[PDB]
Amino acid sequence: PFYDSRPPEGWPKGSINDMDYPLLGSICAVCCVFVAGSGIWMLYRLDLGMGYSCKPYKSGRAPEVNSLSGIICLLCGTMYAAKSFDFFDGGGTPFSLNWYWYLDYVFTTPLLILDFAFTLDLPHKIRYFFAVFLTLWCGVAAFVTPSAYRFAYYALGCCWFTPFALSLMRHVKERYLVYPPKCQRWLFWACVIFFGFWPMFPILFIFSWLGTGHISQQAFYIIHAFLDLTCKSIFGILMTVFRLELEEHTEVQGLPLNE
Amino acid sequence: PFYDSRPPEGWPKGSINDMDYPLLGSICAVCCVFVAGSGIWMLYRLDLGMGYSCKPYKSGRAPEVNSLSGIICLLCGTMYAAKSFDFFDGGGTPFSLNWYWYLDYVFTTPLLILDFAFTLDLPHKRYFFAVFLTLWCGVAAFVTPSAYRFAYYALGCCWFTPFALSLMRHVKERYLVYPPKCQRWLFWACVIFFGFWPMFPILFIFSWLGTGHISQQAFYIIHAFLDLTCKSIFGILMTVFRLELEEHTEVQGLPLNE
Amino acid sequence: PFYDSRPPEGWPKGSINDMDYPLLGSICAVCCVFVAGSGIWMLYRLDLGMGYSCKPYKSGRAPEVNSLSGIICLLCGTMYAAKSFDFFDGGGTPFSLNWYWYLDYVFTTPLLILDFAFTLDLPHKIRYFFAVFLTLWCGVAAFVTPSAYRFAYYALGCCWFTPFALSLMRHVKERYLVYPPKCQRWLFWACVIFFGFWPMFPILFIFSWLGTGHISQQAFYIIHAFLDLTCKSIFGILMTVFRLELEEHTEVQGLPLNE
Numbered sequence: 001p002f003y004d005s006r007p008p009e010g011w012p013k014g015s016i017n018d019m020d021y022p023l024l025g026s027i028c029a030v031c032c033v034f035v036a037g038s039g040i041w042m043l044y045r046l047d048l049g050m051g052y053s054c055k056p057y058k059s060g061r062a063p064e065v066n067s068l069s070g071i072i073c074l075l076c077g078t079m080y081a082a083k084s085f086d087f088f089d090g091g092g093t094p095f096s097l098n099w100y101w102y103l104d105y106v107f108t109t110p111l112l113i114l115d116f117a118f119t120l121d122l123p124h125k126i127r128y129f130f131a132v133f134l135t136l137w138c139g140v141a142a143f144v145t146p147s148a149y150r151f152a153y154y155a156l157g158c159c160w161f162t163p164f165a166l167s168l169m170r171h172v173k174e175r176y177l178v179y180p181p182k183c184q185r186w187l188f189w190a191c192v193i194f195f196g197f198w199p200m201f202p203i204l205f206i207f208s209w210l211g212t213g214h215i216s217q218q219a220f221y222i223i224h225a226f227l228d229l230t231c232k233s234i235f236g237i238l239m240t241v242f243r244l245e246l247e248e249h250t251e252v253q254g255l256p257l258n259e
Numbered sequence: 260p261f262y263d264s265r266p267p268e269g270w271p272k273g274s275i276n277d278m279d280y281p282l283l284g285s286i287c288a289v290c291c292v293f294v295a296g297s298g299i300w301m302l303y304r305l306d307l308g309m310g311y312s313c314k315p316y317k318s319g320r321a322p323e324v325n326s327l328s329g330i331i332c333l334l335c336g337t338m339y340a341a342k343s344f345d346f347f348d349g350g351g352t353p354f355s356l357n358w359y360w361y362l363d364y365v366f367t368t369p370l371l372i373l374d375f376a377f378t379l380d381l382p383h384k385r386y387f388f389a390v391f392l393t394l395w396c397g398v399a400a401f402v403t404p405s406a407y408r409f410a411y412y413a414l415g416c417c418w419f420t421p422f423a424l425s426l427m428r429h430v431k432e433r434y435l436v437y438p439p440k441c442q443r444w445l446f447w448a449c450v451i452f453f454g455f456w457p458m459f460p461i462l463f464i465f466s467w468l469g470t471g472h473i474s475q476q477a478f479y480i481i482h483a484f485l486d487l488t489c490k491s492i493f494g495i496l497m498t499v500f501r502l503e504l505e506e507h508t509e510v511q512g513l514p515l516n517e
Numbered sequence: 518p519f520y521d522s523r524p525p526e527g528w529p530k531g532s533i534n535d536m537d538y539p540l541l542g543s544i545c546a547v548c549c550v551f552v553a554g555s556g557i558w559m560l561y562r563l564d565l566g567m568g569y570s571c572k573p574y575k576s577g578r579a580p581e582v583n584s585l586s587g588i589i590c591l592l593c594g595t596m597y598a599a600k601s602f603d604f605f606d607g608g609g610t611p612f613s614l615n616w617y618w619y620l621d622y623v624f625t626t627p628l629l630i631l632d633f634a635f636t637l638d639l640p641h642k643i644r645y646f647f648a649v650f651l652t653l654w655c656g657v658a659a660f661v662t663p664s665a666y667r668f669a670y671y672a673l674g675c676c677w678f679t680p681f682a683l684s685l686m687r688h689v690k691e692r693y694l695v696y697p698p699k700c701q702r703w704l705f706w707a708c709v710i711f712f713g714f715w716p717m718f719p720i721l722f723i724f725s726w727l728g729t730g731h732i733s734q735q736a737f738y739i740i741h742a743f744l745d746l747t748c749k750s751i752f753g754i755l756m757t758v759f760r761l762e763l764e765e766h767t768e769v770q771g772l773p774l775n776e
């Protein structure tokens with residue numbers, strides 16, 4: 001999709017691409033290591049067995065959808081390795097996963113909500129997947145649109161995120177009472193991350209360089225690196241622990257849910 | 260994928276991009292509203308229950324593949340909102356869903372046939388990929404400036420002609436299964452399918468990339484109407500056919516003619 | 518994604534794009550015909566029935582995942598028809614499936630391993646799919662990166678292919694003892710192709726024009742056309758014959774596996 005490139009003399013001074021690229025690349029490398037290691041741990045723990053007792057699977061293999069968390073974390077870590085490669089090369093690299101904002105997210109966070117929908121047995125998994133997909137593509141369109149119509153694209157995304165986030169919460173609540181108090185605690189701390197960090201992205205858009213102009217692109221990159229460390233890595237860890245508690249309750253102890 | 264952009268002085272006069280952009284944007288906005296509302300109604304009606312009696316689902320939720328029609332209509336409505344944004348900005352916008360013809364279709368109409376294959380229990384749900392490939396052969400045909408675009412078009416005609424011939428046959432095998440009311444709804448859906456899908460290849464020949472009889476603006480209006488028919492009306496007809504099928508088999512418990 | 522195009526006077530002499538385009542287009546057309554015909558035969562044979570006896574399916578239709586081999590071969594044949602169109606037009610065509618190396622592969626070979634995972638009942642089908650996906654995208658990034666960081670991208674791909682290829686082999690071995698000796702023979706000849714031709718691509722990268730500079734882009738195109746004739750077409754034929762023998766053993770004769 002690329003047309004632009006870093007000028008031979010470098011990015012013009014004062015432009016949004018005139019960033020601290022060694023620092024951004026170091027942050028991206030650290031994020032890559034952390035998120036990829038978290039995904040590797042999730043896959044290894046999933047292969048260990050069901051619950052904290054590590055009860056062997058009857059088929060000898062874990063459910064395929066249960067690998068979604070670790071797969072998403074490993075894909076995010078690989079894209080952050082690519083981001084570190086792009087930043088350490090000075091930015092504007094032909095294969096830049098940093099250039100088009102939220103283009104990487106159209107790969108992780110839809111699958112992520114799918115994983116969430118598979119972990120909580122949430123209804124309308126395809127509906128939630130496509131809502132997140134369209135919201136992220138509206139964000140990509142807003143960040144590639146140089147006119148005021150980007151605020152239209154943003155609004156379009158806000159027309160896809162506000163219902164979804166309102167629906168998901170409701171559905172999440174319907175599942176929350178089902179689970180035992182310990183799984184409820186893990187789910188509570190995962191939903192705190194979800195419903196307190198997903199709304200941050202729309203707010204960050206308004207104060208970014210494409211909005212009120214209060215947040216620079218470098219600060220945007222650092223903020224979104226921390227958000228991906230939270231929304232992918234920490235949220236996936238919390239989902240893995242919630243799954244372990246649910247399996248210990250229902251598969252190891254055989255106890256029924258509060259449904 | 261974009262390399263081109265609207266020139267600072269505007270699109271050159273007499274070029275294919277020198278179109279009535281306020282009119283195209285208004286048409287795209289109306290299409291967005293209509294198709295998105297149709298998808299919202301499809302999802303709401305699906306959540307209402309099975310059949311016309313709105314029989315509650317045993318699990319409390321509808322089948323996931325049954326949301327395909329409304330999801331496709333909502334995705335098409337969102338892409339038409341993006342198209343209206345592009346047209347109202349004068350065209351040639353970096354995120355232009357109007358520039359690359361049939362690029363948007365690679366997202367809807369494959370899923371659409373999937374929905375169709377899921378609604379009629381059609382074999383080789385193959386079909387999807389065939390449509391996929393066909394549409395990509397269209398995309399290339401509209402980005403190739405040489406005569407080899409007619410090769411790409413022909414390649415698509417080598418993927419659409421068998422598929423459309425196979426689908427019909429398979430559709431016929433399912434048509435006798437369904438009751439006469441579901442048969443009526445299926446008949447009116449298949450009329451749209453087999454009478455409007457062939458239009459796109461014919462429209463290619465007489466477009467600016469063929470005989471030069473249809474301008475790009477007329478192409479946009481024609482395809483807006485076609486998307487209003489192939490996505491919106493066809494999805495409505497499929498929803499009504501599903502409602503009749505559920506009323507026959509799930510509410511009344513009657514068996515199919517299989 | 519295209520920015521470049523063939524210059525009005527043609528590709529500069531001595532450049533990597535200054536290739537024998539009629540020859541490349543003829544090779545691509547022959548490959549298209551062969552691979553598309555192999556996919557058509559695979560789908561027709563699948564529709565014939567189970568096993569060598571062509572036992573009719575109970576539902577009257579074959580399993581959907583069993584069409585993966587023929588679908589992949591037909592998609593590869595269509596992409597090779599597009600490649601022949603691009604080459605016969607002189608290269609650098611806006612819809613060039615030859616320009617971005619391994620970009621076409623991100624469409625076939627993941628599905629291919631999925632097909633493999635479905636044919637051998639291999640665990641972690643999604644994990645293998647995403648590993649191949651990420652390896653191929655790392656290859657695409659390496660072949661679009663003009664700096665030394667391409668060797669980083671390559672290494673990233675080598676960090677995704679080496680574990681996967683090591684895991685797959687192990688899992689394949691666990692399945693190999695299950696199957697009867699005839700299915701074992703067909704599986705052996707398919708795994709020979711897999712584990713002896715998939716490692717070739719990383720080695721070909723090193724000696725290509727983006728590495729040591731020993732293999733030209735034209736030679737790369739011919740080599741990869743032959744590899745796609747082997748990895749898609751011949752491997753799909755071997756998988757179809759293995760499936761036919763397995764169905765003759767288990768569905769026609771009703772005999773159990775060595776599990």
Ligand SMILES: *C/C=C(C)/C=C/C=C(C)/C=C/C1=C(C)CCCC1(C)C
Pocket residue numbers: 102105108109135136138139140142153154155156157158161198199201202205227228231232
């Ligand atoms: C790990 C990454 C995550 C969880 C990304 C989440 C993204 C969103 C909640 C998207 C937000 C936006 C929309 C509401 C539309 C306007 C633009 C965005 C992308 C900032």
Ligand SMILES: *C/C=C(C)/C=C/C=C(C)/C=C/C1=C(C)CCCC1(C)C
Pocket residue numbers: 361364367368393394396397398400411412413414415416419456457459460463485486489490
């Ligand atoms: C709502 C949109 C629909 C139903 C689109 C349908 C598209 C086709 C039937 C595709 C037609 C073409 C081919 C046969 C190949 C040549 C190029 C196309 C895209 C016009």
Ligand SMILES: *C/C=C(C)/C=C/C=C(C)/C=C/C1=C(C)CCCC1(C)C
Pocket residue numbers: 619622625626652653655656657659670671672673674675678715716718719722744745748749
């Ligand atoms: C029919 C095509 C096939 C089987 C393609 C296979 C591709 C690979 C085994 C990929 C190899 C590479 C990686 C290990 C990363 C570095 C770059 C590649 C793409 C050469």
Ligand SMILES: [K+]
Pocket residue numbers: 068069070072073112232233235236237
């Ligand atoms: K995760």
Ligand SMILES: [K+]
Pocket residue numbers: 042043046066067068069070071240
């Ligand atoms: K996991």
Ligand SMILES: [K+]
Pocket residue numbers: 075076077079080104228
């Ligand atoms: K990322």
Ligand SMILES: [K+]
Pocket residue numbers: 096097098099100101103104
């Ligand atoms: K990007």
Ligand SMILES: [K+]
Pocket residue numbers: 098099100
């Ligand atoms: K940028």
Ligand SMILES: [K+]
Pocket residue numbers: 097098099100101102103
């Ligand atoms: K970005």
Ligand SMILES: [K+]
Pocket residue numbers: 065066115118119
């Ligand atoms: K799960």
Ligand SMILES: [K+]
Pocket residue numbers: 068069072112115116232235236237239
């Ligand atoms: K997760």
Ligand SMILES: [K+]
Pocket residue numbers: 327328329331332371490491493494495
């Ligand atoms: K629809």
Ligand SMILES: [K+]
Pocket residue numbers: 301302305325326327328329330498
């Ligand atoms: K629907």
Ligand SMILES: [K+]
Pocket residue numbers: 334335336338339363486
């Ligand atoms: K559309």
Ligand SMILES: [K+]
Pocket residue numbers: 355356357358359360362363
């Ligand atoms: K487009």
Ligand SMILES: [K+]
Pocket residue numbers: 357358359
């Ligand atoms: K155009």
